[PDB]
Ligand binder design. Sequence first.
Ligand SMILES: C[C@]12CC[C@@H]3c4ccc(O)cc4CC[C@H]3[C@@H]1CC[C@@H]2Nc1ccccc1
Lengths: 235, 230, 9, 10
Amino acid sequence: SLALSLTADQMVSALLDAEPPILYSEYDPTRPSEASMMGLLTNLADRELVHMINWAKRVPGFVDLTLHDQVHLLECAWLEILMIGLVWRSMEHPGKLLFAPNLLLDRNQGKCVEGMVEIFDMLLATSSRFRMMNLQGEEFVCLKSIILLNSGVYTSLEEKDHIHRVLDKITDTLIHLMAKAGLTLQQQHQRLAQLLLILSHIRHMSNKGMEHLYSMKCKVVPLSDLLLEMLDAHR
Amino acid sequence: SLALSLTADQMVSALLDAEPPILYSEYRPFSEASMMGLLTNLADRELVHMINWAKRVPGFVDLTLHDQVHLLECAWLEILMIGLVWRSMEHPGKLLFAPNLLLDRNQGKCVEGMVEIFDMLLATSSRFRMMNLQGEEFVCLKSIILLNSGVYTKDHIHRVLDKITDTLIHLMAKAGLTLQQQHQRLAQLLLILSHIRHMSNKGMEHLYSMKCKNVVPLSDLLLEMLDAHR
Amino acid sequence: KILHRLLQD
Amino acid sequence: HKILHRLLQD
Ligand SMILES: C[C@]12CC[C@@H]3c4ccc(O)cc4CC[C@H]3[C@@H]1CC[C@@H]2Nc1ccccc1
């Protein structure tokens, strides 16, 4: 009942106040391999997963759901949420992806692991896309919560209409923010459409990344037991 | 460009006029090899009409030939799916691949991995059915898929996407929806496109494994569209 | 399920 | 070369 009762600014406050921290990697610049970089990124994503799970419980309405539903939404959206966060961190670093403050990688270093290059370029294009749009942090936290609630919603239970009720609320928040920035009604709609079309590409990168991840398993730095469980959820 | 100089109604009518035809299947209960043969035969014939539908999408001929190839290679399975999902709207629990080929979830169990994609498609059509998705909205969503799915892999394309967004709102303001109902339905429609992309990626992978399984051979065109995703 | 557990704490 | 080029040009 709380999520439906919040206001637009009350929405932005909770989301902004719920932001997980930017974690550091175990990267050592004294050493340059493919396996080294691969194990670094998966170790970081594993530690980020713990913060995301407790971040999701801070997302308005998410704790009103059954827990079978919370598992499913996170199992389907976790890599999307990691990717959009990475892309947001990298906005002010053209040509580079900021996986962590001590780990800033560009194209040539991303090619060190096979198949990573294409996903690397898609992540760069997304971060560059957020750069042209001048994406605001208030809009980012809104998009990230939309990914959590929308990615698994299409997979008796009255919980779906509640989720869509939360989703419409977040749309009102995004529109409320764009009106504050002095956009016209036509500008608010176009910008709302542009932001949501990015989520289609973020879904695409996630599917591609999830399959390159399941091959890294079958191929060799192992992954954490949490990452393997999240990976079994997609396979 | 001529696409930007179009009113919202002139945009709707151009898209409706460009609609490809509904094709028929070839015509016994289904084996795995028989159902996949009919599905890939139908998809191959539809791709020829989709290419000519794409050239009639406003602004699509303005792109270079390379950009046309890229956008179609990316979105072709998405476009087929949103067409299947739109046709199956007034047939709950069923998927209308062709007027003579209406399948349900049990017939999806005929093929390995087809059942999961089947349920995702039935859920999408059910979602449209509950939103009362209109044909003028559907033709806008399908064109959005064409121009958006491969654009991140461009300034003109985003100008046409904005034009279609103007067209969608223009349609919803006609139906009598308030301003708030216009953002929300616009957001709800575009959020479906994320799921449609998800189904395309899953279907593209099953099509790839069926290629190496080599049950039914595929047309060279359908194989070239499939190879572009590898 | 680890995710099931971490959501409980 | 690609069949897609033909149908896009015809
Ligand atoms: C690729 C696919 C068969 C073709 C399907 C199709 C055909 C015509 C049409 O108008 C729409 C669609 C939408 C779905 C398409 C299917 C996606 C999954 C199918 N392929 C497949 C291959 C091996 C195993 C399981 C599924």
